[PDB]
Amino acid sequence: FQPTYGVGYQPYRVVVLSFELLHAPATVCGPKKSTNLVKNKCVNFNFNG
Amino acid sequence: AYTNSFTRGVYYPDKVFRSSVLHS
Numbered sequence: 419f420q421p422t423y424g425v426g427y428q429p430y431r432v433v434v435l436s437f438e439l440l441h442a443p444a445t446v447c448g449p450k451k452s453t454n455l456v457k458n459k460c461v462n463f464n465f466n467g
Numbered sequence: 468a469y470t471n472s473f474t475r476g477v478y479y480p481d482k483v484f485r486s487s488v489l490h491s
Contacts, residue, residue: 441482441483442482
């Protein structure tokens with residue numbers, strides 16, 4: 419690689435974030451505030467997404 | 468030497484709970 423080359427020949431850094439978007443327990447999350455838990459009442463909910 | 472495997476070697480195919488069901 420030389421900076422004199424045309425953009426087709428220029429270096430690109432590439433990253434591929436790969437997700438195991440499984441049923442299995444999550445070691446990674448988006449930053450979100452957890453509420454406390456609730457029971458025996460009709461609620462909207464989110465567990466691990 | 469060789470032998471019969473009988474009904475060995477089933478394993479939980481996915482990390483999901485299921486109960487009282489015949490699952491394909």
